[PDB]
Amino acid sequence: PGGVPWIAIGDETSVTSPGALRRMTSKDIDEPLVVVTEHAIANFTKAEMALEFNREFLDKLRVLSVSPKYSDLLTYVDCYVGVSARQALNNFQKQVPVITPTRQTMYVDSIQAALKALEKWEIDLRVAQTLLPTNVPIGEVSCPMQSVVKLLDDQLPDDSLIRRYPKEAAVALAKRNGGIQWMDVSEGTVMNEAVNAVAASALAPSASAPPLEEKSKLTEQAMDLVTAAEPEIIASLVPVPAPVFAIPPKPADYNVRTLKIDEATWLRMIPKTMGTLFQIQVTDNTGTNWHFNLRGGTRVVNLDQIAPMRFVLDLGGKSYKETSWDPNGKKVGFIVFQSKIPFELWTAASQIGQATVVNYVQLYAEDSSFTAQSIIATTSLAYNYEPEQLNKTDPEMNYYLLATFIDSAAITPTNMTQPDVWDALLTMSPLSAGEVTVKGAVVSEVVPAELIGSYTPESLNASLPNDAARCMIDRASKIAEAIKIDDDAGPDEYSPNSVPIQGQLAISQLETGYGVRIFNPKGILSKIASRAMQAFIGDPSTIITQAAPVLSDKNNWIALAQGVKTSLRTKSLSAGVKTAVSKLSSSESIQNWTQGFLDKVSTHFPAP
Amino acid sequence: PGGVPWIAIGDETSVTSPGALRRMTSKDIDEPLVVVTEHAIANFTKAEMALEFNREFLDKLRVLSVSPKYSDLLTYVDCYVGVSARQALNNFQKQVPVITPTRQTMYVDSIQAALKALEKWEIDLRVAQTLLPTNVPIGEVSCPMQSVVKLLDDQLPDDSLIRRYPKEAAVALAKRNGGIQWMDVSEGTVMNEAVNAVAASALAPSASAPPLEEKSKLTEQAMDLVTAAEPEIIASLVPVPAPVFAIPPKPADYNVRTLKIDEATWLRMIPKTMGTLFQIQVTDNTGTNWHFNLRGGTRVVNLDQIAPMRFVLDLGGKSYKETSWDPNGKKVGFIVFQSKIPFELWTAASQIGQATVVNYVQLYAEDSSFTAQSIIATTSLAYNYEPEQLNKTDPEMNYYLLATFIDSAAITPTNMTQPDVWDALLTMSPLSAGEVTVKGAVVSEVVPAELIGSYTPESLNASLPNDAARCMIDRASKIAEAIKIDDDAGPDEYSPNSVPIQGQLAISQLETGYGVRIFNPKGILSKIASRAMQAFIGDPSTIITQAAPVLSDKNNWIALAQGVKTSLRTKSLSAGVKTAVSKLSSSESIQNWTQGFLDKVSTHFPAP
DSSP, X not given: OOSEEEEESSSTTOOOSGGGEEEOOTTTOOOOOEEOOHHHHHHHHHHHHHHHHTHHHHHHTTOOOSOOOGGGGOEEEEEEEESSHHHXXXXXXXXXXXEOHHHXXXXXXXXXXXXXXXXXXXXHHHXXXXXXXXXXXXXXXXXXXXXXXXXXXXXXXXXXXXXXXXXXXXXXXXXXOSSOOOOBTTTTBOOOOOSSHHHHHHHSOOSSOXXXXXXXXXXXXXXXXXXXXXXXHHTOOSOEEHHHHOOOOOOEEEOGGGOOTTTOSSEEEOOTTSOOEEEEEXXXXXXXXXXXXXXXTOEEEEOTTSOSEEEEEEOTTOOOOBTTBOOTTOEEEEEEEXXXXXXXXXXXXXXXXXXXXXXXXXXXXXXXXXTTOEEEOOXXXXXXXXXXXXXXXXXXXXXXXXEEEOOSSOOOTTTOOOSOSOOSEEEEEESOSSOOEEXXXXXXXXXXXXXXXXXXXXXXXXXXXXXXXXXXXXXXXHHHHHHHHHOOOOTTOOOTTTHHHHHHHHHHXXXXXXXXXXXXXXXXXXXXXXXXXXXXHHOGGGGGBTTOSSTTOHHHHHHHHHHHHHHHHHOOSOOOHHHHHHHHHHHHHHHHHHHHHHHHHHHHSOOO | OOSOBOBTTTTBTOOSSSTTOBOXXXXXXXXXXXXXXXXXXXXXXXXXXXXHHTHHHHHHTTSSOSOOOHHHHXXXXXXXXXXXHHHHHHOOEEEEEEOOHHHHHHXXXXXXXXXXXXXXXXXXXXXXXXXXXXXXXXXXXXXXHHHHHHHHHHHOOTTOHHHHOHHHHHHHHHHHOSSOOOOOTTTOOOOOOOTHHHHHHHHSOOSSSSXXXXXXXXXXXXXXXXXXXOHHHHTOOSOOOHHHHOOOOOOEEEOTTTOOTTTOSSOOOOOTTOOOOEEEEEXXXXXXXXXXXXXXXXXXXXXXXXXXXXXXXXXTTOOOOOSSOOSTTXXXXXXXXXXXXXXXXXXSGGGGOSOEEEEEXXXXXXXXXXXXXXXXXXXXXXXXXXXXXXXXXXXXXXXXXXXXXXXXXXXXXXTOOOSOTTSSEEEEEESOOOOEEETTXXXXXXXXHHHTTOBOHHHHHHSOTTSHHHHHHHHHHHHHHHHHHHOOOOTTOOOSTHHHHHHHHHHHHHSOOSSSOOOOOHHHHHHHHHHHHHHHXXXXXXXXXXTOSTTOOHHHHHHHHHHHHXXXXXXXXXXXXXXXHHHHHHHHHHHHHHHHHHHHHHHHSOOO
């Protein structure tokens, strides 16, 4: 039963309009009055049963021997009943169980106090169960009870009260587990007295089959995984908003000096062989001006369009030692320029436009265990790039990122010849969570089907940490895991989730398309479909990888994704025979090992 | 129902005292009477229903065609049944459901055998389901039965038992497929009257809305995340028990030559300029004597105070070539010295004290990739060291670990100038996670608020994996996941998640500003809060950053954490319609694509 008590606002037994009704009050019988659910009553009853499970310790504690009996508190009455006034006006009810919250609280507090008091006995009882094996993998085994007692007495806790109170522990163990047997000395009677025994036999797995509940649970978990993956999103053929498609990104490290300009569209560089060299000066946050020289081959990250990004650089163990340059004790910084002039075209400092020195550190160099090898001390040079902090308005304004040793005074060009210090190990942390990259560009939305099989290994490797392909691969790996949970078919073994792929391949060959037509036998297509599904599960990143042999078709991909979900939808308590038989064989062998151990115990713990 | 019928030995449940109560017996009517939960009765009924899905195949097996009616086996009789004797005395009931354990076992075994018998026929039927697209975006859709039959014949597998039993298969398809309806031979009527459609609706979206069970499961996963987080503990600013916060440590690799002792409190190395080289010889437990000399500038692991640790060393690629000594084929060893004098304070041979080589490796080297350069082969010198073996009883006693070449024969120091072979790839596995440093100080117990915002990026890098900050970050990642489930709003958009954040900033705005004091608009406050929240979504681990301007307030994080847990607890079935509707639209277009493909197939295999 559910709802709250409603009493006539004004005239008793003549109520017609909602205006005529009001919430019935405690003063009408002013504490709360609530309808008691049968389900709650049954659960409290189960709670009392757990208390009876722990009854021996509480009695030995000489405290609260009387059981709570929650059913006593219930009060059933005929009246208008509803969660809202409307229901009660249309819902008069009879004998509704009712109680005040405060009384329920007192009852629960008493139960909680009881559990806290019984805390030690249950732990000691579990210790008694774990002292020796208390359960058998299959069937049952038995041994000399006096020999069993000898072993228990030998390993029993020294301070255990059970050493003074064995019988209560014996009753408790007999209550939870059917196998342990304590004969009644008075009648010499022995029989299972447990009331959980029937339930245990009901919930035991069959002689050759695992429990039905396990199959249902696994299938439900697989469906939850598929729902979390979002098959419609992964297999989407229409544009998907970047926030909807994207998932949390992960950091990536790069060496800018070693990057290939034919791979990265996010970097700009001054042409080499130009012989260009010019020193430039930039103020720091304290207003100190710092001067450094720019030369051909100097490269910069093109900040515009890359989103807010945090960069941390570690040069530890590097050399960078020059004929007139020693990195030891040097100072380095990250340089960011803001100007309308392209960096590659820069020949003078003014084309750098707005620049500020905001960060620098003093370097340390040392010599390695290998002779003639010098090691730079570990560094953590960090630059935070906020495009919003720049607040770019003028499109002409171009943003460039540089990392180089920084000095307040223009450097003698002969002393330091490097175009930049980008030959360093860089750790990048995105400062943007709203930008994703597709086809070399940040995207507000993407086509997942187009995403399928659209990246070469080189392109994916060059991709930034915010790349859509990486997010797609993570979603694909979740789907592959879900498909593998749903299908236990081996490679080259057909399944309800692979045959649709075989059908798609057959339809594709039949379809009038382009190129040399061929007919493939159904069995071969079926084997290929099984292999394709296994390959997808093994390497979900293949889905955005170019040249997928069979998974390349977005329609094939959709069919497979939909098929696994449907298999879960129409599946009822499915199971695998091979695993169950292996478990039974293992259980029997373990039982044999246990029986041998018990025989050894009987020899080493002979009954007195 | 449940519990154990209770009476005195002469009459069960008739004992004034608890011990004599006895089980109801067949003489009362040697299996004990077994009470059954109403839920248990319903589940057994569902199991019998499960048999009916392919019960036609059982009829093919001619086994248990009759519906089971285990409820008939259930027998209701008035009696006193008590889980505890006290309980049975307290309450008396009538028409108690009863069963014999053996009968229950036989019934369950029979049901399991039936499922096992129907497994192959059911698998063929599931393959038949997988043969065609079987999911529809709204309700159910159907296809030409004749065209469907043509396709079944086109792709039908010969081995299918359906070839053995087609009519039953047709009945089963009608039983479980809304789209598949067979015209009645007698009535020429095609329709679905099966309860599978009722079953589909049970897990299907509601008449007025999409299914909310998935949203409920997602909310439950979020509550599980909150339970794992224990945020008040993870937001503590006051002393916390170390074990509850502590979590398992992770092994990490470092190069001692690359190691920077000054930045890290933990790192210990003999200072350079001591320049002390002395040859020492000791024998091991086996009794092998080894001659080796400690040299100036040598650094050693400070074993004292670091607890148990296992270390693996790779020296491959270090030239290490002596004038008359070839590094290839040489043996190097790890030496542990135990003595009162500080290793840095060591100036004489006697100072090393209990110095022992725990492990040593002899290895061969070959030419490297570098032109004219040879490379030592890949190596893993490894030793596991724990505190008990040292058994330190004296604080003066200090323990140190060193990597250097070790040989039984005396080795001339002039030829080999290396202070140590510590300039090598090293893998260290922690055997203890009890050491943390905060406030620039090593701490026995850790305060999460002290952990919050206490490490600079270089300082965090200095912090070892055992540092509490990493554990705080993992707890934050679970919290971050909960926050993400809670809010899917776009960046810079005010949201329920940021309400605690805006309130915290507002209190900060209320706070009198020490030195510079300014007032910021609540809408501007909302924009900044949105940026801050998006930044957290980008990187939760940033919270540990010392004095993090973005993550400056620990109390704000603590308050938000309580608020986020509340929002998850407060959440009552709230979900977003737009993504689902877009997915349904794509699904409908896919359904249209599927219809077109089936149409082309009918062109190939037209329905008569």
